[PDB]
Amino acid sequence: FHTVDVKGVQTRYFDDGQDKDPILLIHGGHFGFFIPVGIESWGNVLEDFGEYGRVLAVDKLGQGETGLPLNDEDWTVDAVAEHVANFATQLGLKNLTLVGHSRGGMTAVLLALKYPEMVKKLVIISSATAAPAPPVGMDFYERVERTAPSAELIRHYHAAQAVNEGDLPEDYIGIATKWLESEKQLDAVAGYARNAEEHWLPSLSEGRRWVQERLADAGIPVPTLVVWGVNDRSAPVSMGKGLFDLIAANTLDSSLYLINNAGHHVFSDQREKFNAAVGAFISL
Amino acid sequence: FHTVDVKGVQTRYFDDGQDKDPILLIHGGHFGFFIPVGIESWGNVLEDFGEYGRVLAVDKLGQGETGLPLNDEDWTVDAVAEHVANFATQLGLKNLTLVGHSRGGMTAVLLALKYPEMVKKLVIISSATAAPAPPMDFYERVERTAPGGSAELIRHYHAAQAVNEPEDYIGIATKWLESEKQLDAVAGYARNAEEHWLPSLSEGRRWVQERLADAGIPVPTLVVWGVNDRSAPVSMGKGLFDLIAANTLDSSLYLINNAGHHVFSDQREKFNAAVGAFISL
């Protein structure tokens, strides 16, 4: 991988680096989250999407191997999105296809809404931040954290959310274990404990309100695909269908793809289907 | 463009014809429907799918230029599906990708459930027949609010259906609308609907649902729907996909926004991209 200084934040990323239009992958999780998330969490997609463009993937602010925010005020969704935007600008990325999984999706949306000039296409995978609440379901992550005996924790989480499950390669287990036991993770947990109530959570609620407000106005200004696994255990499909209902309201160029026998990690559960559909979408 | 006899029935079909695995397109509507439907209604699809395989298409029983059912007891859904099946047997199609639209979808589904050995995979487009029952009738309303005719009827119908914007189809449908076969078909429907065809719909639906709740569809399935379908609401599509997903692991749903009942016409590029992707798996 590579490292670049983004506004004083040391930032790790992956680059193809083919002579094609860029595809930017934005992973899930958040700074201080009990499961460490990074570029390697994309597993095979890093390689596979090489068929459809110049793949890049960045560790988000305070995750993977990129440094934590330099300000308490930067423990916000806007600061994460801004970090990704500044990152893309530093590399001179132009005809960008944004691909966002889970919270990354949120990040992705926020970019597509705020910087249309930079974005050509938007792909949203299992992002429930702006999604309408289910009728009744939603304590998945608390349960997963509770039922864990740490490599064991990572293995356990993966097994917990998988539907067409496979076992994680030992290399990824090693990398993520290193993340989980790193000083930066400890600092990230302390930082979340310090800045959650004052900065992160309110920015989350306001982010949801503003996104939904935009979807009910002019909608997303770029072509948008929503991908969801039918058997998602942490982000129920109902939320995906509701989200897409919110999106189709004023975004004419939008689509919804639901894959059966797939969990929160759709790309991991139904690799071939995912690659085919999303690749076809990116390719037009 | 081609003609062949099927069980004593003059049947017209289209062939690509390439050295590729077959793709059988099944159009919608039914015999005696006030709007005549045929192969031409597939428009660009007929050519566009030449990339994903050997495209074949066929006018269903008592539609297009194919003949009417031989007896009145053959005005059933099963008769239509069996007609297409015997057509396939006579042509000997193996590794077959079935693509059905509207009522055609229903046909395809039956073919997928009765003859899995023949079918490689299934695509269902805007077929509400096997869908869960929803909570004035659209087509009756369209016919009621139409002017004469008959070009104005076809244009009124397509206007009533279109959301986001084939010449061959318009011309030929105008010609069919004033043909004798269409008259005979309307009379035949008027005669055999209440006794045969509608019960055939009820039973067909019941058996298909019951089959989905058992072992599900035996082949990989894609459901395609237009969000702004006037004739068959998206809720029916999502319901049908629920029923399918219950026991069909390899199943998928694709919802295209800014698209109505004729999805392939309203959003050609997206449709071709997704369905083509599915077929190339």
Numbering used by the authors:
A (entry chain A): 24 to 160, 163 to 174, 177 to 311
B (entry chain B): 24 to 158, 163 to 192, 196 to 311
What does the publication say?
MehpH is a monoalkyl phthalate hydrolases discovered from Gordonia sp. Strain P8219, a Gram-positive bacteria, and able to dissimilate several different kinds of monoester, such as MBP, MEP and MEHP18. Here we report the structures of MehpH, a monoalkyl phthalate (MBP) hydrolase that catalyzes the reaction of MBP to phthalic acid and the corresponding alcohol, in apo and ligand-bound form. The structure of MehpH, determined at a resolution of 2.3 Å, exhibits the typical fold of the α/β hydrolase superfamily and is composed of an α/β hydrolase core (residues 24-152 and 225-311) and an α-helical lid domain (residues 153-224). The tunnel is narrow in the body of the structure, but significantly enlarged at the substrate entrance, due to the flexibility of the NC-loop. The catalytic triad, composed of Ser125, Asp259 and His291 with His291 bridging Asp259 and Ser125 through hydrogen bonds, is situated at the bottle-neck of the tunnel, suggesting this tunnel may be involved in the hydrolysis process of MehpH.
The final construct used for crystallization contained a deletion of 23 amino acids on the N-terminus, which are predicted to be disordered. The twist β-sheet in the center of the α/β hydrolase core is formed by eight mixed β-strands (β1-β8) and surround by nine α-helices. Some residues in the the NC-loop (residues 153-164) that refers to a protein segment of variable length and structure linking β6 to the first structurally conserved helix in the lid domain were not assigned because of the discontinuity of the electron density. There is a penetrating tunnel formed by Loopβ3αA, αA, Loopβ5αD, Loopβ8αK and αK from the α/β hydrolase core and the NC-loop, αE, αF-αG from the lid domain. In the absence of MBP, the NC-loop becomes disordered to keep the the active site open. A Dali structural homology search revealed that MehpH shares the highest similarity with some meta-cleavage product hydrolases, with the Z-scores above 28.0 and root-mean-square deviation (RMSD) of 2.3–2.8 Å. Structure overlap exhibited that MehpH mainly shares high similarity with DxnB2 in the α/β hydrolase core, while their lid domains vary obviously, further supporting the ability of the α/β hydrolase core to accommodate different lid domains to achieve diverse substrate and chemical specificities.
